């Protein structure tokens, strides 16, 4: 961890970064970013260093940096970058695990960081539809959308897996007036009718049968 | 570990050249028992009769004569809330003859009138006896650290001249004895708020206080000053809570004028000369002309106990570790020689009846004479 002049140490940083010496790269990047918090070299170190965080997977520290800087400077065409990176930090904070490699039974866990990220990327794609990542942030958003969808679907399903129909019906109507297109929803549609006849909400089962026989073929 | 502090230590006792020699240390010991606990009780050579006592509820009349132990009484209420109700006293020794009045920090006061014996009237008082009473004009005046200022009657008592002062929230351990003249009682303070009472209902003549005190933007723990006004000619010379020389030339009323000078320990008035110690533990002298100081001293800097007493042209000084330091052929006279105890010393010395009078932190008296 040197304290070389910002030019030299920033060059060696870029070397270790396009290299991928994430640990030492981050050490020296932080060394510069603190040795001078100000200067184009400094804020370049800032963006490259939050990049080396989120890739080195310093997602607590990554969110720390992104939000500390939106405090430090709130708007930029890197609010493309900033919104994207803070949302994506929330995202891989939701998805920081090894089952993400084993790859079985995901997305029914927490979306709270993921909803922070949906807000983030959405404010982006609407206030910044002008980015190199716009439709990629959209890929984020659609993933996150169907993701939280099937999450809550699993959850309400579990609730009725105990057997109490009424609250599950509440959950599913809520998610309905939220975003009723994900297959989580269309698959949730059997749940309400089953619950209805179980609660003997016969006519309500009929009405939801109409709306699904519409939505279904 | 609890005491891991690099505080300034004793600038040691100097060479012991003193052609003046301590010809006596007349011994006698009630043996008690002060240890190191806080108070200033002190010898009073009442007709050279020494009603001696110490920190248990012990008493015995003695005499500056080899001290025969007279009038020994058990001084504790074996009745009441407790057996012997452990007798512990932060109230100086007072008598009028054998009328040994005293008041206890336990909010109790007593007149051991050993002019007639143990005719002592118990007093459950407002406040706690922390300062010395003042037997003036048939009255008694004290400073409890209750902020209050009462007055009573010798051997009988009655609440009167009721006054109250202000406190620092830190509730500093300060006290102040009033200095009266013509019924104009001039007392010191602890918040620096100073008053001068005419006992009308105990009414003051005052509009001011010393700008210097402790408690909020606090100061050194070496501005230690025995807060008590000393009035000569009506010219009250003040000894401000912080090192700040002040002269209050009272003239049929309260007059103030602060001829400032730091280093407040206490002072002795003798005409145009003062013989004082500085708060930083060094002994000065001064001419009363605005504050012209004299009398350098550094050999005994930051010695712990300082207790001087002047008699036979000898401002004899008492320090702890049972040492005795002597002032003499006054400056350039600064050298000292004696150490009669290792029991150490802790309180004020008096030179009464031309004799010297001393207590040891434990053990009554080892009567040293020039």
């Amino acid at each position: 961890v040197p304290d070389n002049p910002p030019n030299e140490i920033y060059a060696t940083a870029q070397q270790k970064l396009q290299d991928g010496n994430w640990r030492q790269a981050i050490t020296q990047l932080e060394a510069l970013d603190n040795r001078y918090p100000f200067g184009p070299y400094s804020q370049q170190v800032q963006l490259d260093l939050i990049y080396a965080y989120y890739k080195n997977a310093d997602l607590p520290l990554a969110q720390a940096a992104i939000d500390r800087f939106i405090r430090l400077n709130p708007t930029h065409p890197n609010i493309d970058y900033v919104m994207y990176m803070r949302g994506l930090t929330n995202m891989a904070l939701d998805d920081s695990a090894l089952q993400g490699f084993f790859g079985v039974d995901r997305s029914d866990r927490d979306p709270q960081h993921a909803r922070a990220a949906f807000s983030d990327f959405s404010k982006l794609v609407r206030g910044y539809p002008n980015s190199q990542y716009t439709t990629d942030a959209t890929k984020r958003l659609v993933f996150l959308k169907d993701r939280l969808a099937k999450y809550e679907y699993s959850v309400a399903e579990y609730y009725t897996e105990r057997g109490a129909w009424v609250a599950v019906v509440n959950r599913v109507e809520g998610m309905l007036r939220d975003y009723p297109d994900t297959q989580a929803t269309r698959d949730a549609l059997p749940l309400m009718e089953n619950a209805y006849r179980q609660m003997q909400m016969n006519a309500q089962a009929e009405k939801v049968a109409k709306i699904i026989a519409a939505n279904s073929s | 570990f609890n005491s891991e502090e690099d505080v300034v230590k004793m600038s040691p006792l100097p060479t012991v050249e003193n052609q003046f020699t301590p010809t006596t240390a007349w011994s006698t010991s009630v043996g008690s028992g002060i240890g190191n606990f806080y108070s200033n009780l002190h010898p009073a050579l009442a007709d050279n009769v020494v009603y001696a006592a110490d920190r248990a509820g012990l008493v015995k009349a003695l005499n500056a004569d080899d001290g025969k132990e007279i009038w020994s009484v058990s001084l504790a209420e074996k009745d009441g809330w407790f057996s012997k109700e452990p007798a512990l006293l932060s109230g100086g020794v007072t008598v009028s003859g054998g009328h040994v009045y005293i008041g206890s920090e336990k909010a109790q006061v007593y007149a051991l009138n050993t002019s007639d014996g143990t005719v002592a009237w118990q007093t459950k008082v407002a406040g706690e006896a922390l300062s010395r009473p003042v037997v003036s004009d048939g009255l008694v005046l004290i400073h409890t650290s209750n902020g209050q200022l009462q007055a009573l009657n010798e051997a009988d008592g009655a609440v009167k001249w009721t006054v109250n002062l202000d406190m620092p929230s830190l509730s500093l351990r300060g006290e102040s004895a009033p200095t009266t003249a013509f019924g104009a009682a001039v007392v010191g303070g602890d918040n620096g708020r100073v008053s001068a009472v005419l006992m009308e209902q105990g009414q003051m003549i005052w509009q001011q206080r010393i700008s210097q005190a402790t408690g909020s933007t606090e100061i050194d723990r070496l501005s230690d000053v025995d807060t008590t006004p000393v009035v000569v000619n009506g010219v009250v010379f003040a000894l401000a809570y912080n090192g700040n020389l002040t002269a209050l030339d009272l003239r049929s009323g309260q007059i103030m004028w602060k001829r400032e000078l730091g280093s407040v320990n206490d002072f002795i008035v003798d005409g145009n000369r003062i013989y004082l110690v500085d708060q930083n533990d060094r002994v000065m002298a001064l001419t009363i002309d605005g504050g012209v100081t004299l009398w350098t001293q550094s050999d005994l800097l930051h010695r712990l106990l300082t207790s001087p007493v002047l008699y036979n042209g000898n401002l004899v000084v008492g320090d702890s570790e049972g040492y005795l330091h002597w002032i003499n052929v006054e400056d350039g006279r600064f050298v000292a020689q004696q150490k009669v105890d290792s029991s150490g010393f802790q309180t004020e010395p008096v030179a009464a009846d031309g004799k010297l009078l001393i207590q040891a932190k434990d053990g009554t008296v080892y009567s040293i004479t020039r």
Partner: protein, 782 residues
């Protein structure tokens, strides 16, 4: 008169901007007052000030520098505090160090830190720092501060106390006037807070006396400026008792005031004690939240009447609202099932209100232990008179129990035994226990996994595997060539919501051969009716056990790994049903029910002990593979493994399917070919252990790790003997037919348990007058 004004070395603002910023310019006659105006303009900057205003003739040299920035850091002297805390106090006070720090502010911050030491009622002797002006503009401070530590300095003083003795009242107080240590349970260090504490302490107490009138005392903190002298009093004015009489209730509610005064059952002439009515009141609030109306308005005044010391109680209670619930939300199980969390509940979201069911589910969680935070954050919805919202935050305890080991393979290849224990099994709520031992001569298998829930209620089904190849033959045989293929599946049925009653089964195969010269084996064989040889290890056996299993468990346990005041009992018993190839009767019991002497529970006790008895069913006996042993374990520390148990003697087996030379001593070819009294813990058919321990997390540890660090001391008792025992065959040999086998050891216990693994350092010097002690005062349990 100046003509061209120059500024060099700005680096932050323009030379012309510097000229225009100060009210002076080219073309005004600069006199001394004009120079002073340039000076006061440079000083009006507020961020940076440096006046070097030189003027010789017709030119004006003005030079300014900027002290920013200093990064004052090196708080050194941190012995009861941390530098970080100093920085945090500075930043909170507004002295966060991105700092200019003019030469003035040094003493300000030194004495500010010092003043805070003193705010602690402590003291810092000296605080002097070292400048490090890093040559860009950075500076740092080597902050070397000295201490005047003054903490345990108490001496207590009470005045106004006239109905209870001073020191009796001083007793209950934390801040303690310097009493010795050996009675220590707690601490006494000063604080203005701790003062206010003590104040309210006796306040509460004396007002629980019923002595109403005391409310007044001037606070006066005496202070000797000598690090110790604080002899403080406060002038109290004690009060007056009454006698509590009468009931009048104002139940402003859907109607339970009959049940109210039924609860507030206050017989006439009772004694006046605010604690009593406090409790009754509480009960009422319970009963009220019990009915949904958990948001009441309630007030009672004591009609404390004098000349009669009567105190009537006017009360008035107003119902809350019946039904609220809106949200039941949990924050934290981001990598954990929330299905399990809402599985730890009982009621349906969207009903009428009861604080019971919610605190029930929450403490159900905490009964499962395994995590370290309750958060029952329960607000109403902003935007309705109804619809309360709940939030749940926990901090989670984790489990991993996985074992590592290879070798020592010295005469063998590096040995291979495996043990894995992932229960609450991290993939699910299952519970995985798999044990394998393959050291070059053994294939002993063990497998066990079990679900937490399988039916609409949550039944836990558990199967168990264990295959055995236990031969370890010295050369080829006469070395107990053994195979054992055992299986069992397990269930549980508690419907008390407390205690599981059970009825289960278990299977095992056993292949035997290659006996040993111990009497005990042949004793058993004959007891079954098998006639073995006497000078020959020439016998074997095969069996399959069709034996019933019955057990039970209790639970009211207050924590888990670092428990408190726990209460749990668990029974297990084994009887062989008809249809088996073996018969034996075995019952077993253990218990862990604790109670704390510390009620912050920083010091809790252990009551834990077990018992087991084996015997046969009609005609047969409890097989030796079912006997009871002990030693050198976290049941009795300090021994070698399984050291406890009776001794079975060798018999001469001088021709034992190649009775060998130089092995199987004590009556082989090489060894003393005659009879033997053999020293070997063969285990008894009756068992019981005694051990009583104390959670003693020492003050000696820097008490900042409490989820992993734990400290204790131990004692143990041991004795195991045979009940089916004789002396007509054990006369010349010692006898174990009786509880006679006492062992005793005591010692220390520390556990800085990484949640992934504990390393149990186990030193136990056994002190009991008893033989056969084959010991190891060093055990490292994992």
């Amino acid at each position: 008169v100046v003509k061209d004004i120059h500024f060099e070395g700005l680096q932050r603002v323009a030379v012309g901007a510097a000229l225009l910023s100060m009210p002076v310019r080219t073309g005004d006659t600069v006199n001394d007052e004009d120079i002073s105006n340039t000076i006061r303009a440079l000083f009006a900057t507020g961020n940076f000030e440096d006046v070097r205003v030189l003027r010789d003739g017709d030119t004006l040299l003005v030079q300014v520098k900027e002290r920013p920035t200093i990064a004052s850091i090196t708080f050194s002297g941190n012995k009861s505090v941390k530098d970080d805390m100093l920085k945090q106090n500075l930043e909170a006070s507004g002295v966060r160090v991105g700092e200019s720090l003019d030469r003035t502010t040094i003493a300000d911050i030194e004495k500010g830190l010092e003043d805070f030491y003193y705010s602690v009622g402590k003291y810092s002797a000296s605080v002097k720092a070292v400048v490090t002006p890093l040559p860009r503009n950075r500076v740092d401070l080597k902050l070397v501060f000295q201490e005047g530590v003054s903490a345990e300095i108490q001496q207590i003083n009470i005045v106004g106390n006239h109905a209870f003795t001073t020191d009796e009242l001083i007793s209950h107080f934390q801040l303690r006037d310097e009493v010795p240590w050996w009675n220590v349970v707690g601490d006494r260090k000063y604080q203005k807070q701790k003062l206010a504490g003590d104040l309210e302490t006796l306040r509460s107490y004396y007002l629980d006396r019923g002595y109403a009138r005391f409310n007044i005392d001037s606070t006066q903190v005496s202070l000797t400026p000598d690090k110790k002298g604080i002899y403080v009093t406060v002038n109290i004015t004690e009060g007056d008792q009454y006698k509590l009489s009468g009931v009048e209730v104002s139940g402003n509610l859907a109607g339970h005031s009959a049940e109210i005064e039924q609860l507030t059952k206050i017989e006439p002439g009772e004694l006046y004690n605010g604690t009593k009515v406090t409790k009754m009141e509480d009960d009422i609030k319970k009963l009220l939240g019990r009915y949904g109306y958990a948001y009441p308005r309630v007030q009672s005044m004591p009609e404390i009447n004098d000349a009669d010391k009567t105190v009537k109680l006017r009360v008035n209670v107003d119902a809350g609202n019946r039904f609220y619930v809106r949200k039941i939300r949990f924050e934290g199980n981001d990598t954990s099932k929330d299905a399990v969390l809402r599985r730890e509940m009982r009621q349906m979201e969207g009903a009428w209100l009861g604080s019971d069911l919610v605190d029930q589910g929450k403490e159900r969680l905490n009964r499962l232990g395994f995590f370290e935070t309750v958060d029952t954050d329960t607000q109403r919805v902003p935007g309705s008179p109804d619809q309360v919202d709940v939030v749940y935050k926990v901090k989670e305890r984790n489990t991993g129990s996985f074992n590592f080991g290879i070798g020592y393979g010295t005469e063998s290849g590096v040995s291979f035994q495996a043990g894995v224990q992932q229960d609450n099994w991290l993939g699910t709520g299952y519970a995985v226990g798999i044990n394998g031992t393959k050291n070059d001569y053994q294939t002993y298998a063990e497998l066990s996994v079990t679900n937490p829930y399988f039916t609409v209620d949550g039944v836990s089904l558990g199967g168990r595997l264990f295959y055995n190849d236990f031969q370890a033959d010295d050369a080829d045989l006469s070395d107990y060539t053994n195979k054992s293929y055992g299986t069992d599946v397990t269930l549980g049925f508690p419907i008390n919501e407390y205690n599981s009653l059970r009825a289960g089964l278990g299977y095992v195969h056993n292949s035997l051969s290659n006996m040993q010269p111990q009497v005990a084996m042949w004793r058993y064989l004959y007891s079954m009716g098998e006639h073995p040889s006497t000078s020959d290890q020439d016998n074997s056996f095969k069996t399959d056990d069709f034996t019933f299993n019955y057990g039970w468990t209790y639970n009211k346990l207050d924590r888990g790994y670092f428990p408190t005041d726990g209460s749990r009992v668990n029974l297990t018993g084994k009887v062989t049903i008809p249809g088996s190839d073996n018969e034996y009767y075995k019952v077993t019991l253990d218990t862990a029910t604790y109670v704390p002497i510390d009620d912050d529970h920083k010091w809790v006790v252990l009551g834990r002990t077990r018992w087991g008895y084996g015997d046969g069913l009609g005609g047969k006996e409890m097989p030796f593979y079912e006997n009871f042993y002990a030693g050198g374990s976290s049941t009795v520390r300090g021994f070698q493994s399984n050291t406890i148990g009776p001794k079975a003697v060798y018999f001469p087996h001088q021709a034992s399917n190649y009775d060998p030379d130089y092995d199987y001593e004590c009556a082989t070819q090489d060894g003393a070919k005659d009879l033997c009294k053999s020293d070997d813990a063969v285990g008894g058919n009756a068992m019981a252990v005694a051990s009583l321990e104390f959670i003693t997390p020492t003050p000696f540890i820097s008490d900042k790790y409490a989820n992993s660090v734990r400290t204790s001391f131990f004692w143990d008792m041991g004795t195991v003997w045979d009940t089916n025992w004789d002396s007509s065959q054990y006369s010349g040999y010692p006898d174990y037919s009786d509880p006679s086998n006492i062992r005793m050891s005591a010692g220390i216990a520390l556990q800085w348990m990484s949640p992934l693994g504990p390393l149990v350092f186990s030193y136990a010097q056994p002190f009991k007058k008893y033989d056969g002690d084959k010991a190891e005062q060093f055990q490292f349990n994992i």
